[PDB]
Design a binder for this molecule. Structure first.
Ligand SMILES: [Fe+3]
Length: 322
């Protein structure tokens, strides 16, 4: 019994226990906490029944759905507002106003990515850029090809030893440099945007709402614009007409057989009502301590939408496009 959530880092484990204590306080459905060190570790933990659920970006929903795991998305994060909810988001290329280079002229420049194999920060951009890379295909690691494309980048999760260029721009100190966690200041959407804001990189591959949410002074928004796939640059609020892709939101996955979908959904439904957007001041299901990035759920998520039965990873991801 009891849904067992899987954390991919200590800070997430910490938030999970806080979530747990609060659910108990308000006498709602209980949630147990399992701690691991990476998305792939949680995926297998769930596959071998040592955990029941974990929230994942599209790139990992894909890996989770492959054998021998065969995990399936059961609940999707919702973004936007209560009036205008959305179960999707747009991958965009944000740059500083003032430059003239376009999406097809990134050769030799500096890049900031959310993390290795994440949708908006890697899969879409490196996919959209293939024609400009000199990748000889397997057995060559796509990483080598991009590491020789961008003069330097910050790609959290990349092997600092094999492709140092992919990690050179990362701000983490010591072994934290290039970590696929909050240990790395440039990790995830907000981190990649910071990598651009700080001037470490010339472009950041993130989603459409980051600039608007991360700038405490709206006047600073005037310093940014986007790179459109038609080789032109447009305002940040014109993302609908200027994005590299529109993809389905991150999602909670579970076993496709005896995955406890009903229980997981009941937990999320109740957790959303009590600790969701603007609910309890004691705990926010969608929020992370200072410097922490998207613990357990995206910091920008506002709720959940249940995924109808018999929809595997492939079908769920099929909603996305370049
Ligand atoms: Fe994502």
């Amino acid at each position: 019994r009891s849904v067992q959530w899987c954390a991919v880092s200590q800070p997430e484990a910490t938030k999970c226990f806080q979530w747990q204590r609060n659910m108990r306080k308000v006498r709602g459905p209980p949630v147990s906490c399992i701690k691991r060190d990476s998305p792939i570790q949680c995926i297998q933990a769930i596959a071998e029944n040592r955990a029941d659920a974990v929230t994942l970006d599209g790139g990992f929903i894909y890996e989770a759905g492959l054998a021998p795991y065969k995990l399936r998305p059961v609940a999707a994060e919702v973004y936007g507002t209560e009036r205008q909810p959305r179960t999707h988001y747009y991958a965009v290329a944000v740059v500083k106003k003032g430059g003239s280079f376009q999406l097809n002229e990134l050769q030799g420049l500096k890049s900031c990515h959310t993390g290795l194999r994440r949708t908006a920060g890697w899969n879409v951009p490196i996919g959209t850029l293939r024609p400009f890379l000199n990748w000889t295909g397997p057995p060559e690691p796509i990483e080598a090809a991009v590491a020789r494309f961008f003069s330097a980048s910050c790609v959290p999760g990349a092997d600092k030893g094999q492709f140092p260029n992919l990690c050179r721009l990362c701000a983490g100190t010591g072994e934290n440099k290039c970590a696929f966690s909050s240990q790395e200041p440039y990790f995830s959407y907000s981190g990649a945007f910071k990598c651009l804001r700080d001037g470490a990189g010339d472009v950041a591959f993130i989603l459409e709402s980051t600039v608007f949410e991360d700038l405490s002074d709206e006047a600073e928004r005037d310093e940014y614009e986007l790179l459109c796939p038609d080789n032109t640059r447009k305002p940040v609020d014109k993302f609908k007409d200027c994005h590299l892709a529109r993809v389905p939101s991150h999602a909670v996955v579970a076993r496709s057989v005896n995955g406890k979908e009903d229980a997981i959904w009941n937990l999320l439904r109740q957790a959303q009502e009590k600790f969701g957007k603007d609910k309890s001041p004691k705990f926010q299901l969608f929020g992370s301590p200072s410097g922490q990035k998207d613990l357990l759920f995206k910091d920008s998520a506002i709720g959940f939408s249940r995924v109808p039965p018999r929809i595997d990873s492939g079908l769920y991801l099929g909603s996305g496009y370049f």
